[PDB]
């Protein structure tokens, strides 16, 4: 049944989008605001008053105070808009290269493992956005590994902190430790912690 | 006297083509030239393949010049903000060996 | 003076000025001679205007801006001073103005 | 306790959301080891050059920086329709 309207111009809408992404900063936020609205209408997650961070009654326990402070250090209060934003960011196009909000952790107390877990969970719930910020999280992980596994950290960093895939897909590791910057996300380099190379 | 003089008798005599003793401004007053890569000012080259004579090198005054200036995009000397993060435990802080 | 060209009633003056300006060795200009942009922001940072100014003051001004631009230190380097006056292993974040 | 609400519901939401008209980039390929975003610019011989993706630092929109800690409320402070009498359309 023929709708009497102009055909949707794929080839033109795509160019206008590229042009907007190049020239118009609001675009990212506009597209996100759609997906967020979608998540909001999909009615999939709702923040609740009852935090469930600790087993009963280890929060009451004296020995656990360091670990409990360590978790309360990370446990953001739920806010609907922030969560909807998280889910949405997972599928929305990125235009300005996303930076990790930096973590200070020095990984002395065992409870510092929490930060690692906060990343592992981020890898799971949001593999994509994690992929954007992964070098920046590799900087925290390296502080972890240098403490918890200094010998392994020695061999690993000795292989190199980054690498570049070449023709035929073989990895070429840097052979040199150096801090990742998001300036590298658009470069040929990858953080080496995620190479999955034995 | 009148070492400082640049021009004289900016008027036109009705009989002779220029007033006796009227003096035009030095050409150097008008050669804006170029800012060099070093930030030194240069008069325009007098021939192809010649570099310009730097303005400070010679005693003529030059009343047009290329000043570099920062734009609205730059801003130096503004206060800037940072997040400061205290060490988690004082006893975990190391001094030596650095 | 070079602006008097083809604009002053005094004929000999405008002839002599037009002559000095038509020399290869001298060439007046007024305005935006050059434009250096950021390598990342792509916005203009340091422009170079041809002002009507004495070459001495232009040379002092240029020495100053050169001192600022060639130092290659930014506001971010201030955190090092902070890191000196704050407890050891304190962390400082952002904003990477560059 | 929360896994169903993720994998069996919110995953469907991601799936359809992926097909939205404006989700126009390929964002990830599931391979952290190899994936890099395809990069484009609008370039002209006359010398313009506008990357579509740039690293400009924290923007006013407030979308660039990522607080990973958002993970915590999601795990330990959020009801889902599939997770909580428990019937819910």
């Amino acid at each position: 049944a023929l709708r009497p309207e102009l055909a949707f111009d794929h080839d033109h809408i795509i160019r206008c989008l590229m042009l907007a992404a190049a020239n118009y900063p609001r675009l990212e936020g506009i597209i996100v605001q759609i997906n967020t609205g979608y998540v909001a209408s999909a009615n999939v997650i709702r923040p609740v008053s009852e935090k469930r961070y600790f087993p009963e009654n280890l929060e009451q326990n004296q020995s656990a105070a360091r670990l409990v402070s360590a978790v309360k250090a990370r446990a953001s209060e739920a806010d609907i808009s922030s969560i909807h934003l998280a889910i949405a960011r997972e599928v929305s196009p990125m235009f300005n290269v996303h930076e990790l909000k930096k973590i200070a952790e020095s990984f002395e107390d065992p409870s510092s493992i929490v930060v690692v877990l906060e990343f592992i969970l981020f890898a799971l719930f949001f593999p994509t956005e994690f992929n954007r910020i992964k070098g920046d999280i590799q900087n925290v992980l390296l502080l972890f590994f240098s403490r918890w596994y200094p010998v392994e950290y020695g061999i690993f960093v000795q292989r190199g902190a980054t690498y570049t895939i070449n023709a035929a897909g073989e990895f070429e590791f840097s052979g040199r430790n150096e801090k990742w910057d998001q300036a590298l996300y658009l470069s040929e380099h990858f953080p080496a912690l995620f190479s999955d190379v034995p | 006297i009148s070492v400082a003089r640049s021009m004289r008798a900016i008027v036109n005599h009705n009989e002779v083509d220029r007033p006796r003793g009227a003096v035009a401004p030095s050409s150097y007053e008008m050669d804006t030239g170029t800012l060099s890569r070093n930030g030194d000012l240069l008069y325009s080259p007098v021939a192809n393949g010649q570099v310009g004579i730097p303005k400070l090198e010679v005693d003529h005054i030059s009343f047009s010049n290329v000043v570099s200036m920062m734009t609205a995009n730059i801003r130096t000397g503004d206060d800037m903000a940072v997040e400061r993060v205290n060490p988690d435990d004082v006893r975990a802080i190391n001094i030596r060996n650095a | 003076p070079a602006l008097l060209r083809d604009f002053t009633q005094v004929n000999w003056l405008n002839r002599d000025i037009t002559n000095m300006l038509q020399q290869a060795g001298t060439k007046y200009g007024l305005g935006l001679t050059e434009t250096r942009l950021d390598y990342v922001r792509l916005v203009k940072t340091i422009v170079g205007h041809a002002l009507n100014i004495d070459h001495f003051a232009a040379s002092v001004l240029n020495i100053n801006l050169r001192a600022l631009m060639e130092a290659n230190v930014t506001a971010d380097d201030r955190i090092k001073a902070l890191q000196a006056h704050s407890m050891i292993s304190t962390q400082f974040h952002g904003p990477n103005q560059g | 306790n929360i896994a169903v609400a993720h994998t069996d519901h919110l995953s469907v939401v991601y799936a359809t959301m992926s097909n939205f008209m404006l989700n126009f980039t390929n964002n990830f390929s599931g391979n952290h080891a190899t994936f890099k975003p395809d990069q484009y610019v609008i370039t002209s011989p006359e010398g313009s050059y506008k990357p579509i993706i740039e690293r400009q630092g924290e923007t006013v929109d407030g979308l660039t920086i990522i607080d990973t800690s958002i993970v915590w409320p999601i795990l330990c402070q959020c009801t889902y329709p599939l997770v909580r009498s428990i019937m819910e359309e």
Partner: peptide, 15 residues
């Protein structure tokens, strides 16, 4: 505590 996507700035270095 609260989620905040921006940098949580809290001091001002002088020039």
């Amino acid at each position: 505590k609260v989620i905040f996507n921006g940098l949580d700035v809290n001091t001002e270095v002088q020039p």
